[model samples]
Target: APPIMGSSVYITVELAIAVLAILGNVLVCWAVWLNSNLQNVTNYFVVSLAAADILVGVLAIPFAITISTGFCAACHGCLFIACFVLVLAQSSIFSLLAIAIDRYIAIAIPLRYNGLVTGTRAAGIIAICWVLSFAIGLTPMLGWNNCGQPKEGKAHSQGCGEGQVACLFEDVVPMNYMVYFNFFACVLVPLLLMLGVYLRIFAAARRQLADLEDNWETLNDNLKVIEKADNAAQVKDALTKMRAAALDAQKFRHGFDILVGQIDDALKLANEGKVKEAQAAAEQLKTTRNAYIQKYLERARSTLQKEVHAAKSAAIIAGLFALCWLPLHIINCFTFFCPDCSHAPLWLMYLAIVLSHTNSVVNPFIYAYRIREFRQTFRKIIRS
Candidate 1:
């Protein structure tokens, strides 16, 4: 299907992907696992997503082999395609959903995240995802399979669909199941989890910004009230600018104290002439003053930008995760009923699988690209 080469190329590429995915995710897992500083509950979701990607890679093997061996249609071989592959697929999506919730909490309610979403709690969530996946996957083999029920009245002509589709569902299977069961269970369930969680995350950002704007807009009204209480402009500005000013205030006060001391020294000696005369003394003072202000401003700008970027780390990753997987899952829904439809473009299969698998291959890059700490650790492993 991938005219990137030939029929076998997908298999060859996937096998290569299996190896690369394993190595990259293991590097991610090991980075957090052994390092105490990085092992916080928030990062627990990040690394677990990596761990889930590794399983997707592990599951990629049978899929690749099915293509090369040309035995995905065989009854026994078909079982692995249905059961194991879907298990991992379900597991992977669940991990992403969990990570989405984890990020929502971190980005939206940062103060409460540490208190509510602890390491033990995160581990418990991970357990629920896998156990649910296990149950969902084993259902077909456990005797609910309509097609597998009997060949007595069935034609060999009507086969299961490609990948995990046909085996997961039967053509004659009742629509009532998906709407009543699969839709609520498969599509709606994970969809609702992510849908609701991300809604708050995105809107939370806007709401907070709006609150800040409200505070600024209402500053004058509050001032009329606050003058009876605190200094109006100073109190209002400090409340709005606390994060930035908190960091800048100490350094700013230090600079101001030094400047004041310098002014006192100059005034106390104003009557005294410079050792080099008045013109040379004035030039020296202006040059020293310019350099002093420049140094302090640069330091202040650098430190504050660094602090803001660090705070935005979770939101950035959540945005990227949504970006990477969004198109792939939509493609999954579009193609689930039409895997081999001639009405669709021929490249859809290749393109869909490529994008879906890209999430796994690119996750290591995503995790590492955020900052220096991740970059330094994953750099060599990726390079090799």
Candidate 2:
């Protein structure tokens, strides 16, 4: 099959994936909005993720699909695509970095999590991400590097068979930098940070489990003594205290279970190229788990809130990162290997474009799933 023709299958698959991605993200956002109990710092990340995905769908995908379909031959459309991609891509990368740092703080410095991971701080980080993405993307536009140029005559004369095409960047240096930077910043760093944070989280959970077991044993011994009390009223009072303690222990166990499940799911999602989804699941799970922890230590409420915020930041970042680069990567990879393969239909490009857009559209949803406050705000907006 011609490259363009084979693209149909890929496009179809991508369209289906994009739809599901949008729906899944939307569902998460709705869930977060509907439940007052859902709002927290992590929820913020979900919101950010969803918002980015929505933009990808609304802003990036349509134009991209049109371009892929060859609707715009003047090449002006390339400018739009380039600008959009750059902004969103940068936003996504920075967001992931923020999230990673946030997770590190949450696990490594639980005590200081609250002061460090505040809403203001999160906002600042997000702002910085946007700014930086814009700045980097704008570099080409400003002539810091030449972009959107055609290939030289010798290259064109070679008749590579894909049609006469110009190299967009003036030189290979900028292109090399762009590719390496993106690979390192978008793919490598985030993966490493997320992995490290989760490892620490796992360790922390294990320690907590051991402590819970010790507490349970002690509580059981106390209950045995109470059961043997001679005074009926005294025994009854002791029994009540024991039951309460048991309830506390159960809460701790439940919290631990939820935390472990979330971390595990996150790892799975990351591996599956579903970083946004993973972040959403992780944040939601974290919120629920933290709520349980609050029963034991009211102070934990603040701590969990911080963690949620951090997760939200990370999800948004990761989602945006995927959205920005996926399309370009897909196109570059396809074109690089199959230079002569242009006989395929343009709709195939649509699929790649949509897949790329999926990252932005789904990010905010993760936040909504994890944060109750955003959910409430969203609902209020909807009802109004």
Candidate 3:
């Protein structure tokens, strides 16, 4: 039987997007591992994200593209696509949870960020992400959560697993529970952590900005006194540096503000049971954060600038991860409520799979672009 609906245009566009996402992310991973400067506490998370994205693009997308092109035929080929899709999709979700936790630690415990989020720690987190994803994803495959079912009305009259068309579980309760648990633990909790951390960070940043403003006032007064002497040039140079520092501080504060707003919107949608809306909100946050970085580049002066950049980069990668797997889960949620909604076309399903794979692909790029030191180290490694 043909698909209820198709999306050739979406499939084509996704292919192109997948290609670019893969290429850009690969470069990011290369740059980070090869460059010394890029290796930092935050870059570790970036590397994990890149690896996940790469896996999706390299291992998942081709299968999906084939399935979509084949009109979603439930043959061996389609089954193969299904396996990879389920694994990668779940892996991306787990990775996103890890990212949110990482951000929480960074913002909420800034003083201990370095001691806690090390490379080894990051690797451990990534391992956990993959392991959990595999464990959960494999449950359906192993019949723990009714994996072989052909949805509801779509079930073939007589058959079971291998080529036999039959609904796996007699009831949807178990699958629904599994999905809800995954959504709560892997998606909702982590996002709440992110929102809380950002809120705290925003308050701290504002206080710091206020202190800087006072310091700037005092510094200006001091410069005025110093400028009354013959060493006015030295005094003027000192004042110039101080003013630049003030501007840098202001930029950091502004960026943090934008992040807070993004997180707030994301939390609201997630709480409202609008998973797609929440995911879209997360994407908007990423775009807003990218803008924040560009804005900071105009005024950033201190060495701490790297930290600001790295944080934003990590946030974007995290957002991408959220976006990738979220749509499928959202669609899944919709299916639970309205099994016949048909809101997502077959091609859209394929596109969602591709996008989920893309989550892994963009991670490395975020690291390389934001963490300058890591980029250098990665280049050196490549050369060697």
Q: TM-score for all predictions? A: 0.60, 0.53, 0.59
Comparison by lDDT, 1 against 2, better one: 1
lDDT of each: 0.54, 0.53, 0.55
Per-residue C-alpha lDDT of model 3 across residues 1-384, encoded as one tens digit per residue: 443335566566556766776776677677665656666655565555566556666666655555444332343334445555455556655555555566656645767888877888777777777787776554444544433444534434333344432322223225364456655565656666665655554454456556555654553453343334233343444334444544454435666566555545545655565555544555554464356644554342242344345455656665666666688677667766687686576556666655666565555555556655655555665677
Model 1, span 58-96: residue lDDT tens: 875546345433322544345545456456656766776
What is the clash count for each candidate, in the order shown? 1, 42, 19
Ranking by TM-score: 1, 3, 2
Clash count, predicted structure 2: 42
Cα deviation of 7 in candidate 1 (Å)? 3.0
User: Quick one: best TM-score, which candidate?
Assistant: 1
Q: What lDDT tens digits, residue by residue, belong to model 2 across residues 1-384?
A: 575775566556556655665665665667566665665554555455555555555555544444443321222324445456556655655555555666766666766889878888776767676777777655555553433454445345644333333322213214443455544555556656765665665566456556565655654454454435444444445434444554555546766566455545554554565544544554554375347644555444345545555454454555455565566565654554575877334454455555566554455455456555655565675676
